[PDB]
Amino acid sequence: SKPQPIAAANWKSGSPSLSELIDLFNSTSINHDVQCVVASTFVHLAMTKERLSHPKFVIAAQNAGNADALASLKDFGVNWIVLGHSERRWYYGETNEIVADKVAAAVASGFMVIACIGETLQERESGRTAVVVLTQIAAIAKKLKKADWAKVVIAYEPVWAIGTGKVATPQQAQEAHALIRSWVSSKIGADVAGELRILYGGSVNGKNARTLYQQRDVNGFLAGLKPEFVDIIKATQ
């Protein structure tokens, strides 16, 4: 059977609606085992933490790369972090090795890490998805020991599905997630691969999420911080 699913809301920009939305989340009865996550930029962490009280939810930081900042986050009671998201790589210039170093530093500091990987439109079209995605995960694995994988979650997000309204088909998601899991099974261990959560993100919505969740190798979602996130939670069963 599948490991515990995750539904993660990733607040990257802009305006904080933040109060009524958290009201919605706090008032929501969740009838199954699922870890919910709300990630935000540093300046919004204090507001989210004070308002969000639902015990199935945890707060996550994003992008921290300095040991002292990681320590401070932990001290504030933040235990999750999102690293390697699309724009980090294609805009900000975080290389596979920079993301890998951040993952290792965060695991060493006591975090649960959602590490993002995924290919561009051109890589997909040219048949390079596998080498690109597997090279991204390989870079992360090189900096980790086997026991560290208890603290890692992988989010597969095709760059061409992010903000474009073009979601991956259930077949596309499944094929990518199975490929990632197969590599983990071969390079790290079948035991690790069986327990690993691999989340899909890129134009997930309230209508399409449940179908994606039915695929063998999909263990949840990275989605936006929006009211329909409640339906994305429900889609994980």
Distances (CA, A) of 40 to 131, 179, 213: 30, 29, 24
Give the number of other CB atoms < 10 A from CB of residue 144.
19
Domain carrying residue 173 = 1-237
CA 171 – CA 112 distance, rounded (Å): 29
Of 120, 122, 121, 115, nearest in space to 138 by CA:
115
Q: Assess whether 157 carries a catalytic annotation.
A: yes
Structure tokens at 230: 């409640």
HSE (CB half, 13 Å, CA atoms) of 95?
Answer: 4
Distance CA 35, CA 60 (A): 12
Answer for the pair 229, 22: CB distance below 8 angstroms, yes or no.
no
Q: What Å distances lie between residue 15 and 25, 108, 121, 226, CA to CA?
A: 18, 33, 29, 12
Please state the three-class secondary structure of the chain as a single string.
CCCCCEEEEEECCCCCCHHHHHHHHHCCCCCCCCEEEEEECHHHHHHHHHHCCCCCEEEEEECCCCHHHHHHHHHCCCCEEEECCHHHHHCCCCCHHHHHHHHHHHHHCCCEEEEEECCCHHHHHCCCHHHHHHHHHHHHHCCCCHHHHHHEEEEECCHHHCCCCCCCCHHHHHHHHHHHHHHHHHHCCHHHHHHCCEEEECCCCCCCHHHHHCCCCCCEEEECCCCCHHHHHHCCC
Q: Under a CB-based contact definition with an 8 Å cutoff, are residues 37 and 114 in contact?
A: yes
Interacting residues of 74 by C-beta distance below 8 A, sequence separation 6+ = 109, 110, 111
Checking 13-18 for CB contacts under 8 A at 24+ apart, the result is 16/44, 16/47, 18/44, 18/47, 18/48, 18/51
Active-site residue, selected from the candidate residues 44, 157, 175, 195: 157
Q: What angle do CA 67, 7, 114 make, to 5 degrees?
A: 25
**Distance (Å, rounded) from C-alpha 102 to C-alpha 140?**
9
Which of 85, 94, 119, 177 is an active site residue? 85
CB-based contact 192:184 (threshold 8 Å)? yes
Q: Give the integer Cα–Cα distance in Å for 124 and 133.
A: 10
CA atoms within 13 A on the CB side of 199: 33
Q: Can you give the resolution of this entry in Å?
A: 1.6
Residues in binding site for substrate? 10, 12
Give the separation between CA 82 and CA 60, rounded to whole angstroms. Answer: 7
Q: What is the CATH number of the domain that holds 196?
A: 3.20.20.70
Using CA of residue 228, residue 231, residue 233, residue 235, what is the dihedral sign?
negative
Sign of the torsion formed by the C-alpha atoms of 211, 233, 90 and 119: negative
Using alpha carbons only, what angle is made at residue 39 by residues 37 and 14, rounded to the nearest 5 degrees? 135
How far is the C-alpha of 79 from the C-alpha of 88, rounded, in Å? Answer: 21
Q: Token pair 């990257």 is at which residue?
A: 12
- How far apart CA 217 and CA 1 sit, in angstroms, is 10
Number of domains the chain contains:
1
